[PDB]
Design a protein around this ligand. Structure first.
Ligand SMILES: *[C@@H]1O[C@H](CO)[C@@H](O[C@@H]2O[C@H](CO)[C@@H](O[C@@H]3O[C@H](CO[C@H]4O[C@H](CO[C@H]5O[C@H](CO)[C@@H](O)[C@H](O)[C@@H]5O[C@H]5O[C@H](CO)[C@@H](O)[C@H](O)[C@@H]5O)[C@@H](O)[C@H](O[C@H]5O[C@H](CO)[C@@H](O)[C@H](O)[C@@H]5O[C@H]5O[C@H](CO)[C@@H](O)[C@H](O)[C@@H]5O)[C@@H]4O)[C@@H](O)[C@H](O[C@H]4O[C@H](CO)[C@@H](O)[C@H](O)[C@@H]4O[C@H]4O[C@H](CO)[C@@H](O)[C@H](O)[C@@H]4O[C@H]4O[C@H](CO)[C@@H](O)[C@H](O)[C@@H]4O)[C@@H]3O)[C@H](O)[C@H]2NC(C)=O)[C@H](O)[C@H]1NC(C)=O
Ligand SMILES: CCO/N=C/c1ccc(OCC[C@@H](C)CCN2CCN(c3ccnc(N)c3)C2=O)cc1
Lengths: 58, 245, 290, 58, 43, 58
C-alpha cells in the first residue's frame, strides 16, 4: 500500500476500506464510509440551543 | 569584488576589471574521467599545462546590422597549438572549457549580446526555401573552425529553435553599460566518456547581439568581439598517426 | 621515486534538496531600509533572479500544499504517443506483397517528437503497443507476425522469406481479434543515453556534398528495424494498417534545450522552411494596446 | 523479488515503488519517483553564489 | 480564535543627553591618514 | 512448493529462481542461472599449467 493521496475524500481522520490496485487513490473502490451524521446544523442551527421540554419563547 | 577578476590557467592569464561573474555550466566543474565511467583500457595522456591555455582565436567586428556568430567546439582548436596536435594524433578526447569573450566599448556606446552555450548544436538549412527539398548543410557551415560562421536566421538559430529561450542553456549577457566580458565554464557533456575530436563537436558558442549596437557618429565605429577559450582537464587516448579531418 | 614537488600535489556546486510541494510564503511586512535591495538584480550575470515574493510586497502566511508530482519526467513522458504507422495494402506501390520494414525512428510524428526534443540526452525504457486494423477501422480475423531486427540481423525481403523463422529475434504473433500487442523494450543503445541531437558525422574522411547525408546520423540512436508480415504463403485478403504507440518509463533526461517552433519537415534533421519562418507567437498591431 | 537490475533508472540510492511480474526490471511499472529538484544548477549556476538581499555587483 | 499568522504578528532615534556647558575641546595632533576623511561631508 | 524434481537442470548445488504453478518442475520458468564460467577447460587444458610471465617452452 504505497499509493499517492489523490482521492477526492482526503480531509478526515479515519481512512476507508477501499481496495485499490493502481498507484492512484482516486482509482480505488468507493468503499464504505463513516456513519456519522450531524442533523443539528440543518434542523436547529440556532445560536442558544433551547431544549425540548421548555417552551421555546420564554 | 565581482567586477574585477583574473583567470590564470596554463601559462596564460587574462585580467578583467569590469566582469559580471563567472558562471559554471550546469553547476559543476570539468573533471577527469573516473574509473567507474571509463571504457578504454589504455592509459590516457594528460598534458596539463601545454593544452590548458587561453587560446585567443579570432576577432569579429560588430556593426549595427550584425546577425550573430557561432563556433563549434572543440573544432575551433583542432588546428591550433599543442591541443591541435594532440587531438589529431589521438582518437579519443575529453575536456572542459573556460570560455571568455571580450567586447569592450565606451561609456557612450550601447547594446547587448547573448553569448550562450548549447550542447549538440545541430545545424539545419532553409530546406530549399519553400521547405520541400532535403538539403543538408555543407561541411563549413557544420564545422567552421577558428574562423567562426555567421548566422543566417538568428531568430531560429539555423535549427528551428527560438533564440528567445536560448537562455535556458548556460549563458550570460554582455551589455556595454555594465560589463565587457563573459566567462562561461563548461564541463565535458557527452554520453560516452571519451569521443573523437574530429567528428563530434560537443557544443556551439552562440554569440548574438539581441539589442543592437548604437553610438552617435564621432565615436569609435570598430567594436570587436574576441573569444578566448581554455580546455580544462583535457585528456586524450588512442594514439595513431595524424588525421586532419 | 621522485624528488619533485610538482607531481605529488597534482565536485558539484548545487545540492538537490527534496521539494514535494511548492514553497510556502512567510509573512513579510514593510521595509524602509537602505543598503540592501532585493529588487535590483543583475541579469548580465546570467543567473535567474532570486528575488522572492516577500521582499517585494507585504504577503501573508500561505501554507502551499500544491504537489509537484505531475511535473516529474516520469509523469510528463509516460503517455503512449503515436510514433509509427505501417501500411500493408492489398494492391499498390508501397508494400504490395504484405510485408513492411519500418526502421525504428520515433521522430516521424510531431507530438512525441516535440516533447522529447526538449532534452538533448534521454535514457529510458519503453513499452510499445501495436494497434492494428483495416483502413476502414474494422477488425478482421487475420494473423500477423511482428519481429524486431537489430542492427546486423538479416532484414526479411519478402513475406515468405527465411528470416521470419525467428530463431533468435524476438517476435510477436497476434491476430487482430486480440487486444493490441504490448511489449516492453529496454534501453538498448551502446551509449549511455539516446541523444536526439548529434552535431557531427559518424565516419571519418573528407566530407563532400555527396555524403552530407550522414550529418546528424549517430549510430547510437538507430536501433534496428521493425518488420511485420501477414502470416501465410498466399496473400492476405485484407488491407491493413499498424499504428505503433510507445510510452516511456524509467526516464532520465539531461541537458534541456529550446523547444521547436518551426514546422518539422524531415526526420533526423532540424531542417525548417526558409521563406516561411513564422514567429513563435501571435502578434498585435501596437505595443501600447492589447 | 529476485529480479535482475535491468532498469534504465538504476543509479540512485533509493528504489521506487514499481510492481513487476517478470524477472527483468525494465518490464516493471513506471512507479512514482523521488520529488527532489535542484533548480540552482539551471537558475543560478554562478561560481560564488550571491544572496538575494545584496546588490549583485558590489 | 484565529488560525492565521498574519494578524498575530501585526520609538525615537535620538536620546536627550544632559549638557549644562558647551563641550570641551580635547587635544588633537596632526594626521596624515588615507581612507578616513572628516572634512568631506555630504550635504 | 511441493513439486517433483522433474527438471532437466537438476545436478547442481544451488537452485534457481523459477516460478512454477504445476506440480512438475519441467513446466517451470527458465529463470536466471548461475554466472559461473570455467574458460580454463577450453582455453588452456594443459596438464602442467604454465604461467603468463614465463616462456612456455623452458
Ligand atoms: C563592371 O561593372 C560592375 C557593375 O557596376 C562593377 O561592379 C562594381 O564593383 C565595384 C568595386 O567593388 C563596387 O564598388 C564598391 O562597392 C562596395 C560595396 O558597396 C555596397 O555594399 C555596401 C555594404 O553595406 C554594408 O555595410 C554598411 C556599413 O558600412 C551597412 O550599413 C549595410 O547595412 C551593409 O551591412 C551588410 O553587410 C555587412 C558586410 O560586412 C554585414 O556584416 C552586415 O551583416 C549587413 O548584412 C552598401 O551599404 C552599399 O550601398 C550603397 O548603395 C545604396 C543604393 O541602394 C545606397 O543607399 C547606400 O547609401 C550606398 O551608397 C553609398 O555607399 C557606396 C559605398 O558603399 C558609395 O560608393 C556610394 O556612392 C554611396 O556613397 C553598396 O550596396 C563599396 O564598399 C566600395 O566603396 C569603397 O570604394 C570606393 C571607391 O572604390 C570609395 O570611394 C569608398 O569610400 C569605399 O572605400 C571604403 O571601402 C574600402 C574597402 O572596404 C576601405 O578599404 C576604404 O578604407 C574605405 O573605407 C573608408 O571610408 C568609409 C566611407 O565610405 C568609412 O566608413 C571607413 O571607416 C573608411 O574610413 C565600392 O564603391 C560596385 O558596387 C560594383 N557595382 C555595383 C552596381 O555595385 C565592376 O567593377 C565593373 N568592372 C570594372 C573592371 O570596373
Ligand atoms: C516482437 C518484438 O517487438 N519489438 C518491439 C520493439 C520496439 C521498439 C524497439 O526499439 C525502440 C527504440 C526506441 C525506444 C528509441 C528510438 N530512438 C532512440 C533515439 N532515436 C533517435 C535519435 C536521434 N535521431 C533520430 N531520428 C532518432 C530514436 O528514434 C525495438 C523493438
Amino acid at each position: 500500500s504505497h499509493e499517492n493521496s489523490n482521492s477526492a475524500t482526503e480531509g478526515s481522520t479515519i481512512n476507508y476500506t477501499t481496495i485499490n490496485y493502481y498507484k492512484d487513490s482516486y482509482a480505488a473502490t468507493a468503499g464504505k464510509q463513516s456513519l456519522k451524521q450531524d442533523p443539528d446544523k440543518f434542523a436547529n442551527p440556532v445560536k442558544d440551543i433551547f431544549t425540548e421540554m421548555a417552551a421555546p419563547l420564554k | 569584488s565581482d567586477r574585477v577578476a583574473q583567470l590564470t590557467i596554463g601559462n596564460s592569464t587574462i585580467t578583467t576589471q569590469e566582469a559580471a561573474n563567472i558562471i559554471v555550466g550546469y553547476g559543476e566543474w570539468p573533471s577527469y574521467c573516473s574509473d567507474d565511467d571509463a571504457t578504454a583500457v589504455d592509459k590516457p595522456t594528460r598534458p596539463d599545462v601545454s593544452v590548458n591555455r587561453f587560446y585567443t582565436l579570432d576577432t569579429k567586428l560588430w556593426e549595427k546590422s550584425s546577425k550573430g556568430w557561432y563556433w563549434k567546439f572543440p573544432d575551433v582548436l583542432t588546428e591550433t597549438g599543442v591541443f591541435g596536435q594532440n587531438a589529431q594524433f589521438h582518437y579519443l578526447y575529453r575536456s572542459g572549457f573556460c570560455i571568455h569573450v571580450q567586447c569592450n566599448a565606451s561609456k557612450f556606446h550601447q547594446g547587448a549580446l547573448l553569448v550562450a552555450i548549447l550542447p549538440e548544436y545541430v545545424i539545419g538549412t532553409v530546406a530549399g526555401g519553400t521547405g520541400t527539398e532535403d538539403s543538408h548543410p555543407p561541411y563549413i557551415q557544420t564545422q567552421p573552425g577558428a574562423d567562426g560562421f555567421e548566422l543566417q536566421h538568428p531568430y531560429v538559430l539555423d535549427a528551428g529553435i527560438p533564440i528567445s529561450q536560448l537562455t535556458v542553456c548556460p549563458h550570460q549577457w554582455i551589455n556595454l553599460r555594465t560589463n565587457n566580458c563573459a566567462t562561461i565554464i563548461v564541463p565535458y557533456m557527452n554520453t560516452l566518456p571519451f569521443d573523437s575530436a574530429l567528428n563530434h563537436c560537443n557544443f556551439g558558442l552562440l554569440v548574438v547581439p539581441i539589442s543592437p549596437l548604437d553610438f552617435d557618429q564621432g565615436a569609435t565605429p570598430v567594436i570587436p568581439i574576441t573569444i578566448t577559450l581554455a580546455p580544462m582537464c583535457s585528456e586524450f587516448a588512442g594514439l595513431r598517426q595524424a588525421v586532419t579531418q | 621515486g621522485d624528488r619533485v614537488a610538482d607531481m605529488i600535489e597534482s565536485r558539484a556546486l548545487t545540492q538537490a534538496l527534496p521539494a514535494p510541494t511548492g514553497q510556502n510564503t512567510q509573512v513579510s511586512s514593510h521595509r524602509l531600509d537602505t543598503g540592501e535591495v532585493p529588487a535590483l538584480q543583475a541579469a548580465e550575470i546570467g543567473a535567474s533572479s532570486n528575488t522572492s515574493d516577500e521582499s517585494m510586497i507585504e504577503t501573508r502566511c500561505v501554507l502551499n500544499s500544491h504537489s509537484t508530482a505531475e511535473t516529474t519526467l516520469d509523469s510528463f513522458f509516460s503517455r503512449a504517443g503515436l510514433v509509427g504507422e505501417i501500411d500493408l495494402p492489398l494492391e499498390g506501390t508501397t508494400n504490395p506483397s504484405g510485408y513492411a520494414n519500418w526502421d525504428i525512428d520515433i521522430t516521424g510524428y510531431a507530438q512525441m517528437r516535440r516533447k522529447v526534443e526538449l532534452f538533448t540526452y534521454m535514457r529510458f525504457d519503453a513499452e510499445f503497443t501495436f494497434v492494428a486494423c483495416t483502413p476502414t477501422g474494422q477488425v478482421v480475423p487475420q494473423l500477423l507476425q511482428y519481429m524486431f531486427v537489430p542492427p546486423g540481423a538479416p532484414k526479411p525481403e519478402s513475406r515468405e522469406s527465411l528470416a521470419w523463422q525467428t530463431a533468435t529475434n524476438p517476435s510477436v504473433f497476434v491476430k487482430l481479434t486480440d487486444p493490441p500487442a504490448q511489449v516492453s523494450v529496454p534501453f538498448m543503445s551502446p551509449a549511455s543515453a539516446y541523444q536526439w541531437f548529434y552535431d557531427g558525422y559518424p565516419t571519418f574522411g573528407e566530407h563532400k556534398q555527396e555524403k552530407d547525408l550522414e550529418y546528424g546520423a549517430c549510430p547510437n540512436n538507430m536501433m534496428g528495424t521493425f518488420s511485420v508480415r501477414t502470416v501465410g504463403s498466399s496473400k492476405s485478403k485484407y488491407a491493413l494498417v499498424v499504428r505503433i504507440y510507445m510510452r516511456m518509463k524509467h526516464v532520465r533526461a539531461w541537458i534541456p534545450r529550446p523547444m521547436r517552433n518551426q514546422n518539422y519537415l524531415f526526420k533526423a534533421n532540424p531542417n525548417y522552411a526558409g521563406d516561411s519562418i513564422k514567429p513563435t507567437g501571435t502578434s498585435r498591431n501596437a505595443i501600447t494596446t492589447l
